[PDB]
Amino acid sequence: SMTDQAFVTLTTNDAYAKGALVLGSSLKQHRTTRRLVVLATPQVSDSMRKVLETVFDEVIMVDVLDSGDSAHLTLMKRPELGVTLTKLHCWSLTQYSKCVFMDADTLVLANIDDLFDREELSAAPDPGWPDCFNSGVFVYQPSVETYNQLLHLASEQGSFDGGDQGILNTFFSSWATTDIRKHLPFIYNLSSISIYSYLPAFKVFGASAKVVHFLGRVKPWNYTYDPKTKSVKSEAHDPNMTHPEFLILWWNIFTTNVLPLLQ
Amino acid sequence: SMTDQAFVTLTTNDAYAKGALVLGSSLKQHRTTRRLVVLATPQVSDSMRKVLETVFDEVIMVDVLDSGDSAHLTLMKRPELGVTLTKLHCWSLTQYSKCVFMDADTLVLANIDDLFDREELSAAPDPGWPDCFNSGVFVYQPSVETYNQLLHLASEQGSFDGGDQGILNTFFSSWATTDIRKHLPFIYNLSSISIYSYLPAFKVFGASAKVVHFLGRVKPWNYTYDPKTKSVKSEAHDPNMTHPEFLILWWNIFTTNVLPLLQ
Ligand SMILES: O=c1ccn([C@@H]2O[C@H](COP(=O)(O)OP(=O)(O)O)[C@@H](O)[C@H]2O)c(=O)[nH]1
Ligand SMILES: O=c1ccn([C@@H]2O[C@H](COP(=O)(O)OP(=O)(O)O)[C@@H](O)[C@H]2O)c(=O)[nH]1
Ligand SMILES: [Mn+2]
Ligand SMILES: [Mn+2]
Numbered sequence A, B: 001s002m003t004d005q006a007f008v009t010l011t012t013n014d015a016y017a018k019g020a021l022v023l024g025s026s027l028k029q030h031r032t033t034r035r036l037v038v039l040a041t042p043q044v045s046d047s048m049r050k051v052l053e054t055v056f057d058e059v060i061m062v063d064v065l066d067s068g069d070s071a072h073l074t075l076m077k078r079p080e081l082g083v084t085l086t087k088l089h090c091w092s093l094t095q096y097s098k099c100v101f102m103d104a105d106t107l108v109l110a111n112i113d114d115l116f117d118r119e120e121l122s123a124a125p126d127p128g129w130p131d132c133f134n135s136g137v138f139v140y141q142p143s144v145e146t147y148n149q150l151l152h153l154a155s156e157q158g159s160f161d162g163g164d165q166g167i168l169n170t171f172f173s174s175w176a177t178t179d180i181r182k183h184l185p186f187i188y189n190l191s192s193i194s195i196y197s198y199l200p201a202f203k204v205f206g207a208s209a210k211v212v213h214f215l216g217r218v219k220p221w222n223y224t225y226d227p228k229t230k231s232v233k234s235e236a237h238d239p240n241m242t243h244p245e246f247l248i249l250w251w252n253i254f255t256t257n258v259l260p261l262l263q
Helices: A014-029 A046-055 A070-075 A081-092 A113-117 A144-156 A164-171 A192-197 A199-208 A245-262 B014-029 B046-055 B070-075 B081-092 B113-117 B144-157 B164-171 B173-177 B192-197 B199-208 B245-262
Strands: A005-011 A035-040 A058-061 A098-102 A106-108 A122-125 A133-140 A211-213 A224-226 A231-233 B002-011 B034-040 B058-061 B098-102 B106-108 B122-125 B133-140 B211-213 B224-226 B231-233
Touching (some): A014 A035, A014 A106, A014 A245, A035 A081, A070 A081, A081 A144, B002 B113, B014 B106, B034 B081, B046 B058, B081 B164, B192 B199
Parallel strands (some): A035 A058, B002 B034, B002 B098
Antiparallel strands (some): A106 A211
């Protein structure tokens, strides 16, 4: 419980750090009894690292790992995601026996400590290619062996998508066809994209959401929020604004719970 | 080899009948040893029913079942899909021990007779909400009981999406959490939408595709094809055209095998 198990996130800059701060605050809001840890890289300002230390039990400094895999990253219109190979450092955290990695663009809506009943590698399906798991939420076991194996495969073969999700799916390739218990229910990693892609399903299953994941190039922190009206201002033709409940929650927590700690 | 087992499709009009014909032609092309069955409703022309008899072993006339659920259908911008409850008639086919239902907008790329090793209900995940199965390819056991249960649920509750897929997911509730063997690999029902949603995944898994599913409002038969050049004429800004190989194959089979029976 308290000592040997953690939620782990990652930030390589101050932008994704506002995400990590909101994630962290949401985990506390829902009364986790596990540690909170964030992996941070040198591009995170000293000032931000100090703020991160008020929310996370530990801020762990690591080196950026970058795929440099511009062809594969362009293939999915995510030229900026090569630095997500930095996620692989999560397996080096052998101070813990089991952890849940969560993307810095996630938000917790309910206690999810029952994830620690799972075993490596448990993750939810990805809505793009559902025989791949989405790497935004996964339950794993820190291991120097698994760490080095993952580093080796990344250096030798890279990632089919140029980020962490490809390589993690290739390494944990039995996921689609194994033990159904290793398929986390989709409500533990609810892709913002699924809300508009199959709204009828969201309408009957979404009230049970435990985690929302703002996956895709547009992040909550790239909107403009007016605290007085609670209005979110978006770019034109944004399909996520037809169901904005999770975006508003994100901003509520940031303005209320994170903002006071920033100053 | 199975005289007591069939593939089953559905058509309510002459337009999806072109799809059924191409699907049936593709099952023959890949040497199925099973029977081929199409459910058709009164709106299919007499001349079309006769053409369907050259491809399918059985053309079975059934009444249209229509949810009339404009609210849920409109939720997913598919106002025409209420007649998909007609699919429920497939459970009445107790001449067969086991069947694979396939949507009329599917296209077989390899022999898939190994699907008959599965048991009801086996289906692939839906890319919008992957804890629901897509109802375009599924293995089931004809049964008067299951048939009547499904009709009663449709009459009482309707479908959460106004079509067959919602009601079938509600009825086969345990799919997301049961027996992984009942999760068909995504290659047995490859959603055309998944090609452009996670292109990197397509690039490394796509060569293994056994079935493609042209799901969504635009169907292969709504394009304009030039057989001289083998170019497909699309509506503007069509995302599927960046990877057109499956559409081209649909039109080749249509033009070579099917259109001669029509025009
Ligand atoms: O510039 C970046 C890009 C990503 N990340 C980390 O890598 C994760 C995966 O990236 P993202 O969530 O943007 O991928 P997606 O969920 O959109 O596929 C993020 O949540 C962050 O934890 C980061 O720290 N800096
Ligand atoms: O007007 C219609 C619409 C649907 N269908 C049948 O119902 C299936 C499901 O509809 P569709 O494939 O359009 O749904 P999607 O796969 O796009 O969700 C089709 O493949 C056909 O077999 C039909 O016969 N007539
Ligand atoms: Mn993410
Ligand atoms: Mn279909």
